[PDB]
Design a protein around this ligand. Structure first.
Ligand SMILES: O=C(O[C@H]1C[C@@H]2CC[C@@H]([NH2+]2)[C@H]1C(=O)[O-])c1ccccc1
Lengths: 218, 220
């Protein structure tokens, strides 16, 4: 099997500048017919892959002019003349010389922007869920940057780690922020033994924890 | 107008069988070589199989892990390609895409939208949908509402707000799986001058179970 390597898992870039992504193959991709079989694909969050460049440097139809490709033998480069916020996604190279066809692990493009504090919202269990015997407490931490954030749940001042469900969105293609959802799963009975519920978040935009809480008895 | 459309995915029993279809239009299907590529966490994109055109004897090529279990075929009169999968294993779970090389040296130029295949012995279960409304009073300029979708299987569910009329301030998070099955949440942020004056409704559809639910977000 031909091994395709894209060393960088991600590359941070600011809109307006040029950048390049590299890919290497364990064997020359030059065919006897004279063509080099290396293609580049883009996979935007939640969508199917799309061809950007075929055979090293030919731009596919509909692909923006800011993309270009170069390389030969076993080293290739995809370049952006000017990056746009909307270029967020994962970029893959693929060899189309021998079977099985193999893809690189991909390089995610990360758009750099100004710090942005998360907007934190906490939601007590809806009454419809309580009549059903469940009590999920939901906390949304939206539109923040940089991407790393830490969430802590406290039930009557004591921390809780079990029964926490965490989910993260990919970088937004318009404002370049990230969002996260954290859900504390409790049974109605557990929910009623306590009164204070707090969603505590730690982010670079604040020296002190971002706290949001409510009291069941209200 | 070029397109490839897959169909036939969904939940299937380990050791069971499933046939995927791919319908093409907008390009010269009879000249194209057609391939199936799948995606899963850990392997990322993985080439699966290929069938060549009539001129090239309709030859088929398969990746090692599916040889003997999968069969690819095509019907040029219906502009379609099929992928018959047998003895399915948990490792075959993933999104399957149909793609084609329309002409020499063009690469995988056209891709379908993908179809999710989940190999598991668990059973199809509809979701329960719960509106999430703020506690206190707005203000301040914007208000965030949510929708909790839980207890369903398998993926996916589609969540829209006001039948799609609300989309800019929307975040639908990836689902999380544990003993209560899948749990997914979606939030929407709107001007405080929009809610609760205007109706805000979460619409949920779960294709696998044919469930459809519309729940209104009411001030608590
Ligand atoms: O995919 C096609 O051929 C193949 C030949 C070999 C094996 C992979 C790659 N090299 C590809 C290529 O583009 O060369 C093709 C599609 C339509 C019409 C004719 C040929």
């Amino acid at each position: 099997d031909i091994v395709m390597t894209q060393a960088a898992p991600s590359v941070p870039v600011t809109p307006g500048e040029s950048v390049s992504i590299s890919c290497r193959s364990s064997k020359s991709l030059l065919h006897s017919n004279g063509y080099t079989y290396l293609h580049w694909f883009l996979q935007r969050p939640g969508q199917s892959p799309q061809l950007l460049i075929y055979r090293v440097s030919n731009l596919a139809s509909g692909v923006p002019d800011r993309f270009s490709g170069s390389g030969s033998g076993t080293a290739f480069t995809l370049r952006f003349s000017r990056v746009e916020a909307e270029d967020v996604g994962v970029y893959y190279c693929m060899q189309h010389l021998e079977y099985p066809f193999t893809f690189g692990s991909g390089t995610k493009l990360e758009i750099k922007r100004a710090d942005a504090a998360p907007t934190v919202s906490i939601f007590p269990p809806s009454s419809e869920q309580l009549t059903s015997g469940g009590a999920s407490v939901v906390c949304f931490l939206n539109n923040f940057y940089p991407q790393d954030i830490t969430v802590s749940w406290k039930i009557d001042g004591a921390e809780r780690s079990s029964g926490v469900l965490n989910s993260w969105t990919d970088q937004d293609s318009s404002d370049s922020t990230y969002s996260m959802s954290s859900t504390l799963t409790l049974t109605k009975d557990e929910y009623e033994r306590h009164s204070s519920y707090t969603c505590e978040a730690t982010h670079k935009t604040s020296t002190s924890p971002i706290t949001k809480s409510f009291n069941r008895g209200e | 107008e070029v397109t490839l459309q897959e169909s036939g995915g969904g939940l299937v029993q380990p050791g069971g069988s499933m046939k995927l279809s791919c319908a093409a239009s907008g390009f010269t299907f009879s000249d194209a070589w057609v391939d199936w590529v799948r995606q899963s966490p850990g392997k990322g994109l993985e080439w699966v199989a290929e069938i060549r055109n009539k001129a090239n004897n309709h030859a088929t090529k398969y990746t090692e892990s599916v040889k003997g279990r999968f069969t690819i075929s095509r019907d040029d009169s219906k502009s379609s390609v099929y992928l018959q999968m047998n003895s399915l294993r948990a490792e075959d779970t993933g999104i399957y895409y149909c793609t084609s090389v329309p002409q020499l040296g063009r690469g995988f130029a056209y891709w379908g939208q993908g179809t999710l295949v989940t190999v598991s012995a668990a059973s199809t279960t509809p979701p329960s949908v719960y509106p999430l409304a703020p506690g206190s009073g707005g203000a301040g300029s914007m208000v965030t509402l949510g929708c909790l979708v839980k207890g369903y299987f398998p993926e996916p569910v589609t969540v829209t707000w006001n039948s799609g009329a609300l989309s800019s301030g929307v975040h639908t998070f990836p689902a999380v799986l544990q003993s209560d099955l899948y749990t997914l949440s979606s939030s929407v942020t709107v001007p405080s001058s929009t809610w609760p004056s205007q109706t805000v409704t979460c619409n949920v559809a779960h294709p696998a179970s044919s469930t459809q639910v519309d729940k209104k977000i009411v001030p608590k």
